[PDB]
Symmetry: C2
Subunit: 948 residues, 2 copies
């Protein structure tokens, strides 16, 4: 068969679809570089000492059609139950128009963070809608653009609360009826910080122990609705901030955290039409009082002005605070769950306040009806008040029998304690479902009541003093797009403002903006993956178990690590998990004093943030004068701190894009002094099939599946950051269910499980040969671009035949010295050529880092190079005094259509020179939606963006 | 029951009717207020004549939520079985590239616009269509190709009609090879009957040509897979001045010498194999190619290259035929398959299929079976118990083709793997251990068609077929074309007579479920139970809506519906021994497809006058009915009229026709004014067609035929087209028993989600919105043809002729100027020359309606400025529209108006601007709207 099929005319190959440059184009590019074969270039680019000497051991590549069919048979092994398990995840109905035109639209999911706000106004507006929706619902004044999941959001509230206090308190109170995974995430975050987590009963908590904060669940995990006002008042007189983890759908009916006096509200917006996803992805919310706005973690959309005085949005950063409490108040998050926040905000837009309230009201009414019927069947109910969740006492002999009978109908209930079961209803629930529940509990299909007769007993089952009266979602945007046609057009208008991968290459250094192929994306929205509750019984998730087993083995082979955790749900979470595992390792050997983390001064700012969150003390390691890592400063500090040494965090190849052939020795050094080596996987697209982190001395790494392995960038999302570890660290990995484990890094055991299918598909379609070729072509394209631009812009940090790896760093500092042109000028001017800028001013201030990836055609690479060459000449005209140095296209970019068409034109250049500076713009023109937005040095944590 | 009563108590759930309707309750009351009515019911009572008002609720299932309707259809779909069908017969499983599926077929930017009437804002799909034509031209080796036809059978029937019109032969006979696909032969006979054409079905091997023919149709490769050299046959046909058509598989043409090189005059075929779902019959784009010497009588639409006002390249869409559409969406998909794969990719797909087929053949031979095709491409004719072979195949989820006793056919395709090959061998062997090893057979593998038919000529050598092979490049190319086109995701397209309403996501979703999209139209009945349920339900529901006793879902275009309906009437009169009844009465304001359909049916058209108020002249009708009483076949009517009027005389009109022995056919163009409010059968129509792509939400596809089912009274039921391959059936109207079956799920979903209450409300709101627009515009443009109580129905006709008198402004000036405001024009110059007919539908919001009215009002003021000498009568925005960005930005500006006045004439254009891709590009008797 195999040898028979090899004889047949070639079939459609996914590798060819994924690679931008074909064979012909590759030969052209090699010729400009001066190499006969790609193999020759790669032999010079990669140091023999670390070159992986064999083929990756992975399943042979399949066609798109074949991979889909294989994954379909795997998916068919999952069972889609009606899960009434609750615990922070509830089935919901994604309006088809949103599923098709957002979730299944590359126009919405292919861009990354809105670094270049002028060409991201569409998704920034949807995020602003998300924030408004969260503010209205929570009754709190400030809301960010979303966080990873509910549990991590709660941990961010804990950190903020510690930073605000001025007392001797080191305890944080967590109610024992918070969701259990939330408590686990908080404990895991508290451990390296030395924070005492007190898990207790809010009813009886004495406040005899000083706390800086308290977390309460609203409604509680068992469904109970409580009035938290007196707790909140007592907490305040003890100087603690109170955070409510509050179900946002419930807030359409219940008095909100703001009005109860709470200081912070967090929760999941999953119920706003986001698939269960077997854990994710879902956007969590975070809201607080205006007095704490400067301490807000993560990203937040603000309203600014453009150069024409018109309103424009930008994605702001947490302002950098200097204070004695920074060591426990640090956050490492630079992203938002953008795509999912867009989806949740659009759910609110489509339903309106009345539609949302009606959804909640119907859930409540069905829940009340369920309760009445259960009582008529002589079960006991334990919640005095509730929204959507009942706590049913059944008799400790009968509980497993009830759960098994429910399963017999394709229904999951929540096993509470023996003699008790929980039931959470949701938007999908019908009267037919209600009848199934009754019959299950009755043990027969004939009931001693008729469903309709029970209606007279139905009434609001939460107290009057918690019955919300205040309004929400009153702004026009939530009232005017309720027909499918109007929402369709609203989505299209927003999408059209944004430059995504369906327009042009976005060559973001360190971000790997490669192809997010349709076949990879398709299975995400199969219900067998999308409609599974994360806490469903193992018997119903055999397909996911297979998916996990295979992905773990494959990523393990690519990295060379012995074990993989698929849990961490962001790049930053991967770093954090990796450091946590290292910390736990030293603890397991009785060495609680190894807390020094060596970090190269060129590192992305999330690295030391993550280290600080792990209770580590960062020690900077210096760079060369040739831009490589300085071994002697490393050694000097590896000695000075030698018996305190916990870790070295390194990126390979370097953040400067260098294949440092000294990598194995650096590792050999750290080990000599007792430390472990962690590799940041940002630059892993230069490695796949060419070298393996475990082989050169790394003990743990994380991978960015949303970079190297095709999960889309989501308009700014966290993606997934699984970690690989060697055998000696295996015992410490995050738990895969609800023991030397560090605990839980993400709320869900497999993080955002549903998007893992994308990376599975990529590997299945590429195979060993495909994955390796992709790496080699990415290196080819970077070197090609470097070679084309080297006479215009100095290329920094070369080899080794003076080659680069997968990215090239352009030095724009001469343009400032010669023409007073700033890197931001070049970035906006690129928009007029139809391009999103590459990475700006990181790792080197005043430069650009360009990463084309392997997915972009020679034609597209040449156009970008031609744009940069055109911009060089514009700068020359300034330098030579041929144009006004203050009034020129570079200073005035981006140019909107209106600015060129309306009003008086007083520029020493033509409207044509402004809008059509290259031939291709006259065939297809992308219009910047707004002029340059108001407001050099990089943020200290989110290093690729401007300081706040 | 008790659950229903309990459910009604609960807080309201998301209602599909609310999503479908543009105006909400608040907007509706605001519109009723401007009209002078307190309730919608008061308006409708005055709009619909009480004598024809349907007096009860439609009897249809209560509405379901989007979520619930999807779940119900899913349980129906799960009753279908997706087999590996190697049946062939003109349908072959194929791989739709996922990037094309997601970004074209499941993209409203591609499927929501209609025909490119306004070419300046349709350059995207026009270019994709140009690509389709180039692809067909290259593959067939013939010079002129149209933008596609409905299906293979009807395209072959169009070829017959072309041949009849241009052949110099005095013969009246058309030869059809007996090894053409069986359904093709049926469609040809059905089209030939009313024309008096003799169809000769025979063996092309032995046909003597002593019998004179004007045309011949040959299948390449043949239906049983045999590949023949038709050169000698073609030469003899030419000796007799007959035209030869080859029905040629376009994939096979990557390997086989093409029709153009064999001497053929016309080539037709299906492009379904170019990545289009089986669809249980459709929709698929058929191709039609021919020579320049025959060009003038070729059917359908053809994209041409022209120039715009700036001298830049621009596209436009240039034995009678009634076809005005092309299968646009599917032609786009077929051409993008060609663009994605390129010449090499296509040839490799074909070559692998052939190699697999030769391998299959060698293996079957080792197993002592007889192989009957000397030469073949993808299809084997296998001689033996054939029933036991077929049954054994079914046991592995495989369908083979039952030929004659002792013979089975096997057609391989793009999805076939060596594992599938192994399966076929084991079936025929009778065990899993074969007396050979798969790899061992490779040595005997050789090209199994002759050198004399081995293609050497190249194809798809243009750059477009060579530059978009990565997924990223294709995604971007698709995005750029899409971006040029104005579709329903941009703004309302209020085309009178086209009903541009919401094509809801939930309705579209099931089209691409494998259980609907991946079923072969000739799969065994036991595998298609879900479709059987779908058809039964749809037939019952459409019958209740129309009042008819029986529905045929077969006709696969609006024009096919008219044609089918008239064929049924013709057959009725034949059944009564009254062939002399061939007079078709048609109002003079009718769409041109109506008389063309009648002529195709062998009928003689007699026009009927409109009166001084633009209603059917009852006296004239009565006089003509009486005059042609002895010969009266039919009256064709639209209701409400083509002038948009609910005539109170419709029942009287039907009575007069019946009194003189005619039947009444109703064109369903205006059914969006009727649903729930009146029923064609109830007022006297004997048959009608419905346009499912207008009234019932099938997308307009960028110009597609949609589906045109007919409803008939019991006395016509015997004559309906057959639903499977003595009876009184007219035969076959479409190639597939249920036409484009996969898209029928869209109308099922709409009816399931709307319910009887929703369907009726939709109609009422459509009438409300048209009346609202007329009231807003009446002071600026005279409203023509108001009905009783001075109300219109679902559309209003704006008189633009005063603008011509006062300002020398033409309707085309206004149509292009609307582009600068971000709107696609309404229907231009039909049914009344120099006017516009606007149909908003119920799906557009009050905000959108007001913007369109405001644009028309602003344009009225621009005309006034010309009239009053405030601006140059020749150099003004109306004459220079549409304005491209480049024209406003590049070169010298010498107009007396500003660039801002050109590009931003309304405030909304400063919030969102749609840019016309080209400047202005430099009445048809059939396709009347163009
Ligand atoms: Cl491989
Ligand atoms: Cl209803």
């Amino acid at each position: 068969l195999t040898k028979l099929e090899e004889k047949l005319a070639p079939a459609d190959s996914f590798l060819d679809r994924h690679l931008g440059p074909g064979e012909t184009e590759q030969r052209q590019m090699l010729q400009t570089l001066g190499f006969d074969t790609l193999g020759d270039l790669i032999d010079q680019a990669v140091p023999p000492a670390i070159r992986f000497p064999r083929s990756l051991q992975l399943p042979a590549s399949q066609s798109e059609y074949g991979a889909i069919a294989q994954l379909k048979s795997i998916a068919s092994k999952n069972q889609v139950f009606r899960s009434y398990i609750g615990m922070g995840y509830y089935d919901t109905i994604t309006p088809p128009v949103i599923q098709r035109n957002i979730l299944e639209n590359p126009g919405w999911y292919t861009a990354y963070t809105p670094y270049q706000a002028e060409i991201a106004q569409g998704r920034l507006e949807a995020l602003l809608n998300f924030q408004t929706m969260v503010m209205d619902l929570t009754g709190l004044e400030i809301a960010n653009a979303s966080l990873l999941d509910e549990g991590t959001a709660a941990a961010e509230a804990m950190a903020l609360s510690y930073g605000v206090s001025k007392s001797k308190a080191n305890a944080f109170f967590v109610a024992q009826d918070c969701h259990p995974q939330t408590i686990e995430v908080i404990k895991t975050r508290a451990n390296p910080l030395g924070i005492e987590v007190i898990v207790g009963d809010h009813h009886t908590f004495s406040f005899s122990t000083s706390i800086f904060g308290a977390l309460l669940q609203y409604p509680a995990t068992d469904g109970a609705v409580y009035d938290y006002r007196s707790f909140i008042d007592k907490a305040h007189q003890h100087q603690a901030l109170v955070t409510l983890a509050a179900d946002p759908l419930s807030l359409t009916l219940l008095t909100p955290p703001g009005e109860l006096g709470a200081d912070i509200a967090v929760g999941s917006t999953q119920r706003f039409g986001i698939p269960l996803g077997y854990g994710g992805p879902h956007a969590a919310y975070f809201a607080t009082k205006a007095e704490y706005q400067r301490k807000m973690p993560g990203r937040i959309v603000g309203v600014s002005k453009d150069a024409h005085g018109n309103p424009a949005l930008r994605l702001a950063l947490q302002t950098r605070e200097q204070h004695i409490r920074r060591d426990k108040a640090t956050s490492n998050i630079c992203t938002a769950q953008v795509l999912l926040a867009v989806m949740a905000s659009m759910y609110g837009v489509y339903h309106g306040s009345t539609g949302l309230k009606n959804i909640a009201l119907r859930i409540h009414q069905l829940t009340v009806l369920l309760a009445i019927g259960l009582k008529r069947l002589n079960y006991s109910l334990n919640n005095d008040y509730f929204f959507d969740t009942l706590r049913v006492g059944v008799g400790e002999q009968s509980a497993p029998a009830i759960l098994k009978a429910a399963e017999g109908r394709g229904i999951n209930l929540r096993p509470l304690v023996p003699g008790e079961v929980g039931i959470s209803l949701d938007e999908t629930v019908t009267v037919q479902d209600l009848l199934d529940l009754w019959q299950v509990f009755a043990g027969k299909d004939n009931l001693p009541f008729t469903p309709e007769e029970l209606w007279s007993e139905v009434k609001t089952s939460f107290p009057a003093d918690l019955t919300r009266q205040s309004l929400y979602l009153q702004d026009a945007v939530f009232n005017q797009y309720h027909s499918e046609t109007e929402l369709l057009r609203y989505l299209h208008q927003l999408e059209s403002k944004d430059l995504a991968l369906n327009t042009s290459m976005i060559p973001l250094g360190s971000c790997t903006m490669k192809l997010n192929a349709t076949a990879e994306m398709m299975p995400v929205t199969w219900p067998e993956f999308g409609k599974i509750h994360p806490f469903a019984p193992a018997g119903q998730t055999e397909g996911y178990q297979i998916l996990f087993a295979q992905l773990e083995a494959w990523l393990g082979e690519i990295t060379g690590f012995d074990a993989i955790s698929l849990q961490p749900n962001a790049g930053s979470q991967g770093e954090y998990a990796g450091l946590q595992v290292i910390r736990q390792y030293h603890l397991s050997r009785g060495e609680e004093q190894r807390n020094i983390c060596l970090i190269p001064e060129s590192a992305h700012g999330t690295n030391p943030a993550s280290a600080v969150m792990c209770g580590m003390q960062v020690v900077p390691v210096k760079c060369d004068g040739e831009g490589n890592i300085d071994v002697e400063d490393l050694t000097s500090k590896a000695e000075k701190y030698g018996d305190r040494l916990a870790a070295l965090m390194v990126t390979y190849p370097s953040t400067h894009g260098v294949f440092e052939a000294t990598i194995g020795t650096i590792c050999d050094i750290v080990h000599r002094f007792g430390g472990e080596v962690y590799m940041d996987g940002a630059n892993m697209n230069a490695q796949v099939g060419l070298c393996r982190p475990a082989d050169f001395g790394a003990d743990v790494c994380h991978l960015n599946l949303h970079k190297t392995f095709c999960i889309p960038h989501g308009g700014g999302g966290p993606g997934m950051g699984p970690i690989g570890v060697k055998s000696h660290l295996q015992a410490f990995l995050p738990r895969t269910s609800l023991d030397q484990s560090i605990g839980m890094i993400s709320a869900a055991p497999y993080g955002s499980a549903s998007i893992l299918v994308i990376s599975w598909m990529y590997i299945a379609m590429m195979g060993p040969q495909g994955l390796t070729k992709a790496t080699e072509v990415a290196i080819l394209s970077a070197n090609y671009m470097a070679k084309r631009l080297e006479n215009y812009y100095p290329i920094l940090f070369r080899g080794n035949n003076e080659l680069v790896a997968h990215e090239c760093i352009l030095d724009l500092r001469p343009l400032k010295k010669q023409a007073a042109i700033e890197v931001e000028d070049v970035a906006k001017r690129l928009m007029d050529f139809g391009f999103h800028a590459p990475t700006v001013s990181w790792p080197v201030l005043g430069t650009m880092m360009v990463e084309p990836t392997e997915s972009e055609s020679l034609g597209e690479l040449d156009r970008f190079c031609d744009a940069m060459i055109a911009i060089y000449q514009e700068a020359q005209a300034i330098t030579h005094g041929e144009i006004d140095p203050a009034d020129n296209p570079l200073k005035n970019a981006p140019h909107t259509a209106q600015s060129l068409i309306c009003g008086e034109w007083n520029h020493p250049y033509s409207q044509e020179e402004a809008a059509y500076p290259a031939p291709w713009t006259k065939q297809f023109k992308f219009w910047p939606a707004v002029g340059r937005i108001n407001n050099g040095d990089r943020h200290l944590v989110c290093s690729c963006e401007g300081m706040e």
